[PDB]
Amino acid sequence: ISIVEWKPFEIIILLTIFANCVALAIYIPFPEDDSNATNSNLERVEYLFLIIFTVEAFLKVIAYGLRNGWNLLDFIIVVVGLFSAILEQATKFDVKALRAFRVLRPLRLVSGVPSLQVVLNSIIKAMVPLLHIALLVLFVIIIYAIIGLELFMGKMHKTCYNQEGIADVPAEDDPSPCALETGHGRQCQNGTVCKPGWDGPKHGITNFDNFAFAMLTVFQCITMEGWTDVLYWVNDAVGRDWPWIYFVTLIIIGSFFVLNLVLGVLSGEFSKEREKAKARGDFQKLREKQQLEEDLKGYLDWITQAEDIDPRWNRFCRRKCRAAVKSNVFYWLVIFLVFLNTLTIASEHYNQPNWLTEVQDTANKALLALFTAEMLLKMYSLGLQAYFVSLFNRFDCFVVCGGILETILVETKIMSPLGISVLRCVRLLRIFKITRYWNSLSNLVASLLNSVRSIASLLLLLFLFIIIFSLLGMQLFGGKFNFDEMQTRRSTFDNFPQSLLTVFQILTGEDWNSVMYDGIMAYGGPSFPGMLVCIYFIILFICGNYILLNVFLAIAVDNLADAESLTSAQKEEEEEKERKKLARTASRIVNDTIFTNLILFFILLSSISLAAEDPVQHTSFRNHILGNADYVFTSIFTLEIILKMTAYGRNYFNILDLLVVSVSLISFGIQSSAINVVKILRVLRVLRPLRAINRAKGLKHVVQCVFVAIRTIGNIVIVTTLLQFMFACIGVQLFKGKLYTCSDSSKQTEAECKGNYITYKDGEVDHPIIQPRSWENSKFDFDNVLAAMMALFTVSTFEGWPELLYRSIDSHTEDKGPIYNYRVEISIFFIIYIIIIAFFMMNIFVGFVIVTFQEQGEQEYKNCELDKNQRQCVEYALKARPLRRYIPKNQHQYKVWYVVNSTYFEYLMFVLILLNTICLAMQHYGQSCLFKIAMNILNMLFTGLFTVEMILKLIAFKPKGYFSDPWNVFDFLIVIGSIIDVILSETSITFFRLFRVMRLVKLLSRGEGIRTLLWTFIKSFQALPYVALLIVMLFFIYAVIGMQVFGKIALNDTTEINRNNNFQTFPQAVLLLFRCATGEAWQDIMLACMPGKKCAPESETEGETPCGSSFAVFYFISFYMLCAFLIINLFVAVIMDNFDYLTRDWSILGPHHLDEFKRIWAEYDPEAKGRIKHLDVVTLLRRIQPPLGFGKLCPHRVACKRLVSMNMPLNSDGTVMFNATLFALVRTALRIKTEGNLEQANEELRAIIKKIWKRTSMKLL
């Protein structure tokens, strides 16, 4: 039977695997044991599949006697399938729920394709460096869960219950936590009473009652999805003073810092893989392919036209054709024609005038005829096949073929695909050829087409992952999202396309918590067995985001690096060609230092001044001080300019200072129409913070760097804008005037949807309510191109995109209402737009920033030998010294010191800290009195033990050596906050019990990997304090502008501008901007800031709803773009600062080995000094790590022979000093040289390396 196992038997089994995957898609999970005929057949087909994968595992089992992971998966799948079938037939715990193993069968499609197995291994092998970040995330989640347990435990269980009973939550359809008259949170007021006893904001799922519930809430907040909801619930529960310190800090630490770490590690790994695969020379094949194609058409056209110069009438037939295409006039004429085609395509809109629809149909045919004629003219003058040779010419040929195909229909339906004339806009991308960077865009496309095979493999593995998780979700939650609620969920797992859409939505991370809550309630509620189903959503989110990162960052980084290398090589070749061609043919106190400062302080004070204004109250005593305080502030800057204007006559920042001061001074007057002009020059007062530039060195540097980066990435921005415009045109064709709906679902026209109709509260037939029928459009529609660009932008931001998707799926016909699930196949448009724009273009932009930062800097060309290990080795050897030990004396201190400095004591206290953390982690809601007393006494016992440790280590280490390790002063401050915590506990303040949790960081700061990673990234963050000052300034400026513009809108609890979210205070405006930067409901806030809102009663006819502004669109879009750009800039700057650690190659010698050697050497020296023992070398050569020193070889051997053979410094037997022997060890480890090269190293170290300050007098020999 070992004969038929290598023939296409293995392809027969592969086809069997594909038909057990197209039978798990056809399956429809019906609610409550329902079925149909297709399922009745699929059972028998699965029986046949089970028979086949059994006698095929038997042959391999009785052929080779289960070791490989894939064959083990085969075996387990087969056995559980047989077990499930047998148990199902016998019973004809849940029986049918054991069929979830059948979704592992598609995982075998990569075991039969090694080409997919290699990319799977490449994706998997990048997980190992991220395990440290995973551990850090776990620790942060645990710490914040315990803090939330200690802060908000069981404080969100009271809602308004009305003053007639406790029937059910008579506070809107979305009840919120409240507080009593003795509380600080939200007050119900009017005919309501804040009565204790209530499930929770999300049916009791979102709260800090338990440690598991707190951990789930913390994870959901860290994923940045629905964290403002939790923050606002906490604000309503306990108050609006100190939950922002919790939630904002959690968001900053666990979402931005962690993302920075992940991006840095992934970029370092990708760079290492690139530098390892470049040695093979894969770039050469791409390099040699471009020049072979450049000379191809350059020689074929030479052959072509030489035939026409002749020796039938081609002399008067061919010269003009090739002299018109290359005339530079045909180029511009074709560009103008394409511009006209774009003009007529983009002029289409809903309810257009009847003349426009005729103009744009006549012009379409005319331009189609013209472009076909031009294509035919070019088709023969440059060879029929040589015309096909070119890249963009293939695009033109395909566009013409498709246009001719779709313009002759004129009888069939759905003419939306006829608008492939929009891809003709890609042909005008030759406008880059006239300008620069055309060799940077076309090189990118060439690299993409060269690597399309790996691109397809990477995109297919992601599709397989999505298919597997969609099948698993269809099995788990299929036909279960059917509860008694009146509204029907749209994101369900009922079908295969619906499951695919739901899994894609969860992968994008938008409203994934809603699907998680739906899945949790489908299995009961917040209970131990029911709520374990959230593991599916957690794993799906984490793994999908990780896979998307590893795919779309690898593609972008590799392709962009290849394109940049191609461009650099091409530039070098052009330089060499044009050089060799030329090498032959030719042959007043304002200039002070303290003043300046004092006035950059005033500038800071002036910036602080206008942030403290009152946005809403026009007249208030606080503004009396501030309004008259700016008067004296403006005088100082007015005096500053006059004192300077005499010195000279002008730069570009004195212009800005003048534009500030003159505007302020004229604004002091104005009078007359003090409504419009004042409201412009009052918001023009946001330029004062910008005066810190040119007055604070470093701010100017970072601003100039950001401007250079903008100028570099403008090409990618332009290409993304072009693609967005094309997709907007396609969407306008698809959904023009189709996204209208009526409040009454029974009317499908505007004329019908008129008058009143009866609604029922919660669908209770006994409670009818009259409401008016209204013909409404979608929030973001596709009526015209401008209305579609913004809808696509909001889709790309992953904000409210499922709502638009499910609104577009129902649309069927212009001017008519929706139909449930009319065109589910239209979701491919949104999927493709998200993949191309929100996933590929964004990662291309980030990789472009990374590459343009990497090719800057390191290209300083430090070509004074000394490659990228030895400079660091030499500087470390120069900057080194023996360390201290402090070995107790008093012969009594030694005993306690030995006790406290052992490893067993350290491990014992680590276990004690773990036990204390576990004790803190089980403070549930509704605990009994015995539990509380036991917890109190256990906390007392732990704090006593830790005081005992502290006393032991003041003695052992003395009161000077204790407060020397910074881990000790932090420990000292922690426990003293626990001793006096018990003092105030028996007779409150919640701040003092948070010190116990903070002690868990000692466990985190014990592994050499996480410690080094965190330390290096923190140092890189500290070393760049202005890249974050840029974000701070942007936030401040936009907060002030929002306060001035939208600061008067009313706080309506049913609108997105309310008590928790508003512009009425600088902290509140900053919090709103932070929430928008996270991207929570920024589109909803923008729509709530549009003009026509009744607003603040405390500001003072014809003004019914006169406030608001149409500036909101630009405000909220520009803020999003600028915030994303600046955050990416900061991330890449930190990554490039820390890039040395991210690409380390730990196998080779590194500074960590030097640190270990120093820590081994430290104990043998009583002081720093530099005096050693001659016999100490015996243990020195044995204690060194073999990669750093020598292995398990005998001491008195060639190791000692070479140690003594080297010319040591002319010292005594043991008076040689530490840096000398360190340099000797580093030079013997690597970069070895023959005798007589000492002077070469001596002269080299004083040229490129830092100054020695004549401190190497004894190190010369």
Ligand SMILES: CC(C)CCC[C@@H](C)[C@H]1CC[C@H]2[C@@H]3CC=C4C[C@@H](O)CC[C@]4(C)[C@H]3CC[C@]12C
């Ligand atoms: C899809 C991959 C990860 C393999 C499948 C693993 C999961 C989906 C499988 C393996 C173990 C299975 C569970 C084993 C036991 C029980 C308890 C029973 O009362 C209901 C079914 C239930 C709850 C099964 C549901 C499906 C299950 C959780």
Ligand SMILES: CC(C)CCC[C@@H](C)[C@H]1CC[C@H]2[C@@H]3CC=C4C[C@@H](O)CC[C@]4(C)[C@H]3CC[C@]12C
């Ligand atoms: C040539 C390309 C790049 C740009 C094309 C711009 C022109 C054709 C487009 C862009 C925005 C369009 C407008 C968008 C919306 C409106 C409002 C309404 O009254 C219908 C027509 C009108 C006024 C459109 C007319 C055509 C329009 C002005």
Ligand SMILES: CC(C)CCC[C@@H](C)[C@H]1CC[C@H]2[C@@H]3CC=C4C[C@@H](O)CC[C@]4(C)[C@H]3CC[C@]12C
């Ligand atoms: C996502 C995959 C790859 C890994 C996670 C496995 C998931 C799907 C498995 C592991 C544990 C499982 C749960 C274990 C126990 C129960 C309780 C039972 O009364 C209903 C099913 C339920 C709630 C299971 C649902 C499926 C489950 C959550």
Ligand SMILES: CC(C)CCC[C@@H](C)[C@H]1CC[C@H]2[C@@H]3CC=C4C[C@@H](O)CC[C@]4(C)[C@H]3CC[C@]12C
């Ligand atoms: C580094 C720089 C940008 C920090 C700037 C901080 C300034 C703008 C912040 C910090 C503290 C803030 C104040 C904190 C509290 C209040 C009380 C509130 O009822 C009105 C606003 C007011 C009076 C704030 C005004 C703005 C303020 C002074």
Ligand SMILES: CC(C)CCC[C@@H](C)[C@H]1CC[C@H]2[C@@H]3CC=C4C[C@@H](O)CC[C@]4(C)[C@H]3CC[C@]12C
């Ligand atoms: C790593 C571990 C030890 C951390 C802490 C987890 C344990 C101790 C936590 C998590 C889940 C918790 C339980 C979950 C639900 C309830 C129901 C409630 O009415 C009484 C407490 C009780 C029974 C909790 C007791 C403590 C508990 C068992």
Ligand SMILES: CCOC(=O)C1=C(COCCN)NC(C)=C(C(=O)OC)[C@@H]1c1ccccc1Cl
């Ligand atoms: C500089 C960041 O701008 C964005 O956040 C973009 C989003 C939203 O960010 C994508 C988050 N996934 N949506 C659209 C479509 C974009 C646009 O209109 O380009 C002009 C920009 C963008 C701009 C330049 C380069 C890339 C991108 Cl993605």
Ligand SMILES: *[C@@H]1O[C@H](CO)[C@@H](O)[C@H](O)[C@H]1NC(C)=O
């Ligand atoms: C704003 O709040 C008031 C207070 O009850 C309410 O009457 C009004 O309807 C709200 N505005 C809107 C648009 O609903």
Ligand SMILES: [Ca+2]
């Ligand atoms: Ca969201």
